[PDB]
Design a protein around this ligand. Sequence first.
Ligand SMILES: NCCCCN1N=C(c2ccc(NC(=O)N3Cc4ccncc4C3)cc2)C[C@H](c2cccc3ncccc23)C1=O
Ligand SMILES: NCCCCN1N=C(c2ccc(NC(=O)N3Cc4ccncc4C3)cc2)C[C@H](c2cccc3ncccc23)C1=O
Ligand SMILES: [Cl-]
Ligand SMILES: [Cl-]
Ligand SMILES: [Cl-]
Ligand SMILES: [Cl-]
Lengths: 463, 463
Amino acid sequence: FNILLATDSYKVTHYKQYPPNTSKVYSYFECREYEETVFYGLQYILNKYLKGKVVTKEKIQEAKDVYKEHFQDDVFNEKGWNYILEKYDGHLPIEIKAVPEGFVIPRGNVLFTVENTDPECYWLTNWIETILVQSWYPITVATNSREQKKILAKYLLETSGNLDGLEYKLHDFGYRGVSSQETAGIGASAHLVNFKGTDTVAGLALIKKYYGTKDPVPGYSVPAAEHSTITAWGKDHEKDAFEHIVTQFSSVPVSVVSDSYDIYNACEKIWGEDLRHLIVSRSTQAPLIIRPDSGNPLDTVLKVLEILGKKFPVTENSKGYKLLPPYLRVIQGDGVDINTLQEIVEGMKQKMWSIENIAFGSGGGLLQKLTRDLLNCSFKCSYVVTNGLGINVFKDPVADPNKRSKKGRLSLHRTPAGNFVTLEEGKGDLEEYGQDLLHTVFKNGKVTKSYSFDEIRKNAQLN
Amino acid sequence: FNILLATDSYKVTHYKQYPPNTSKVYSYFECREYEETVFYGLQYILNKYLKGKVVTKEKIQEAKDVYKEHFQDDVFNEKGWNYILEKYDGHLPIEIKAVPEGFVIPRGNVLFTVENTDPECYWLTNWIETILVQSWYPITVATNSREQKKILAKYLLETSGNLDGLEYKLHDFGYRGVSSQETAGIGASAHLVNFKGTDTVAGLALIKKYYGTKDPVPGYSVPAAEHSTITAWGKDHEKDAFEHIVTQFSSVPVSVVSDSYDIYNACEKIWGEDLRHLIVSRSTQAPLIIRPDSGNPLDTVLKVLEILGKKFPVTENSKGYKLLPPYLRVIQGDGVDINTLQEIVEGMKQKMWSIENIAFGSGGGLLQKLTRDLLNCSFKCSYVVTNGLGINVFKDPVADPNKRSKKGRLSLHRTPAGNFVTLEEGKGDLEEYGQDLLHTVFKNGKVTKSYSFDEIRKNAQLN
Ligand SMILES: NCCCCN1N=C(c2ccc(NC(=O)N3Cc4ccncc4C3)cc2)C[C@H](c2cccc3ncccc23)C1=O
Ligand SMILES: NCCCCN1N=C(c2ccc(NC(=O)N3Cc4ccncc4C3)cc2)C[C@H](c2cccc3ncccc23)C1=O
Ligand SMILES: [Cl-]
Ligand SMILES: [Cl-]
Ligand SMILES: [Cl-]
Ligand SMILES: [Cl-]
């Protein structure tokens, strides 16, 4: 990796575009205008990409050579990057202040600021927009995962009367569904801010290296089947595959995808009759979790439950809602996003089914079907000093008030009703709102404040 | 990186689920039945992740330790992975056959096949599903980029009478709007299969290291402004920013975002009157590219052009379509995906505007607003040998016919009419068709067949 090569092409040219005698560019990150967002992911970027000696003689010459051919001119700022190398031993003269990781912030507030600490490096603040704005993703996953926790919590509380197993109810299936190994880790780490159930292994090593937990790993799995391990027995032997699988994993929970041929037959005839004896004997600590994986998600869950309710002893819990015996659960792991997770719980509740009957697997919903669009994640200049005069800088497009940017030096404050407000135009220094809630997280190549994954989990908890 | 940590958790448990006496698992990848999809990206994964010594004593012990905590049990196949280390010096005993990269194959056809080469490693075929299936992303970017090239080609040919500059008409803007650095490089490399214009610099080093080009670089940029470099001059000095920027970049093409306050004023009064004189003097090899970045994309482009047509000398070209003078072009960079790119060119054509007037930049649309669900990218077991007898295996969910999988040993063939067929049940060995178009790309830890980025470009041409 080379930070000189980790920006949008055009930013290479920007040091020739700013007003002359510009000593300071100051830029903020907000989720412009999902009423509240989990701030998480910055600390990864600060450590993996921004901290320490990031500039070397070789990194300057590589960039020089690529940009020379990429632009077909020598528009690269060699002098500016050689200054970083020789003044600061390659350490970025940037100061980043940020709200603490895990913080649940209303939309349209300052979550971090970037500014240069050396007037020579005025151009450096917005060089690192592109890299810093990839934060959108950890923030977005963490927010959409938490929104889903909220829906599950609402219907579990309504149909059971507690949150038991809440943080194991949305399993991450998204390892194949993402754009990369780097993306898998960050995405799966963002979901583990809210839940403890993941198949995306890469997330675990990231949290250990970048955040830390007191526990060995932040996330857990149980044994489960895929279509390869059922269908490999042959279209005539589904029962043999199931029987081998529940018996191999007799003492632990086990997911078995049951839609290889006929979900409704596998539930009713194979689990419900021929193998019923291997399921009703199993421990409360080791249920069979029947996985449908195809068809209308809501219709399939409701017919799966009706079949299972008629072949197994169903309890009515305190709330008047029906419950499988504790050895038997369901997980819908196909076509699940925040919208369909909500269609299912509401559909289950209208049929008087407890939500403790159902778990969710999401892959693409949770980790891939997200954009910087969704929460309008955005990095803009708000303040510059030219000729010694600080001036308040913003965009305010004619046709889009939604894209207006915030003016001048920003601080984040607690209101007397204990809500958040971003103060603009350096009005934070009028101490009308107490102290700035953002902290210095990065200064002059060093990480100056960091959070355990446990602290972030605590910060991110639901009301 | 540790391939023992680079799979779905549940696949760790799969070696205890397959029928006993299973010597071979054979699995294929399809874009299950965007009519045609560019295969690109496998070679990256084979080199970065699968080739050489991938197993070490330390990588087995690390996996054992993580999975012990992750499963709350020792379900890990240490014996199976120690065999790989001690038999094959950690080289995967896998054979992957793949269609040549850049090959444009209709939906529902085998693109790559994975099989174990040693009976002991039956479990290893689907260990690498997760990692291999991330290919959906390079494939989907490459295909969606190409389908957009098709629409550009259609409307340019209809309104100009050639495809001049087609490879620079869709610029990659999506570096900040992807989920990570690794994803940027892959996605930007996938787009450059079809175009030459990128701001996603990370794509350059990937193509150089993994694919190779005869030219210095596969992709090119020009100097261009952001909101920070216009608004930094002060709300009332937009004209000074513009004038500084186009004068700095007098002799090369220059993109200038003009929606900082009011796009329509900046086109009509600032470009069209105040600074008119520095635009009409510019070389045909260095035009001003006015970038609107806000509003209804179609409505904005149409009023932008109507304003510019009334301040600058417009020609009607041979097709009856209108043309800005050669020093003046427009780029819509904001809200651009395949569907809005199509709304715009069709809207432009209804207002008799040549498509050679307009360039497109795409960020989120191009690199992130893509899912594994779009082309149904899918990896399934089709054939296993159990007790020495091959059996043809598949899924066939009753309630989703389109998730039915192919049976048995697969090959890809040219038809008599120059189309493709995927043969099933090992029918390829009848040579009633020509010969299998999949080739050995990976065998027993080696990349065996590779393609230059140039070969891939050639294969991925339009008609
Ligand atoms: N971890 C200890 C706590 C309990 C364990 N546990 N585990 C659960 C789980 C854990 C992993 C898996 N995994 C798969 O199915 N895969 C892996 C995978 C990867 C890629 N593609 C497809 C698949 C299929 C499935 C289920 C669901 C399940 C539970 C099922 C009902 C309702 C519940 N409600 C609350 C709390 C859990 C509840 C559950 O109890
Ligand atoms: N090497 C020579 C290639 C041609 C030069 N050129 N370049 C062009 C271009 C090149 C880069 C940029 N860059 C930005 O605007 N950024 C960078 C960026 C990154 C992230 N977010 C936002 C932005 C804003 C914009 C436009 C458009 C422009 C052209 C404009 C009309 C129609 C055409 N038709 C065909 C061929 C080009 C045609 C064009 O001619
Ligand atoms: Cl599966
Ligand atoms: Cl999914
Ligand atoms: Cl911009
Ligand atoms: Cl975009």
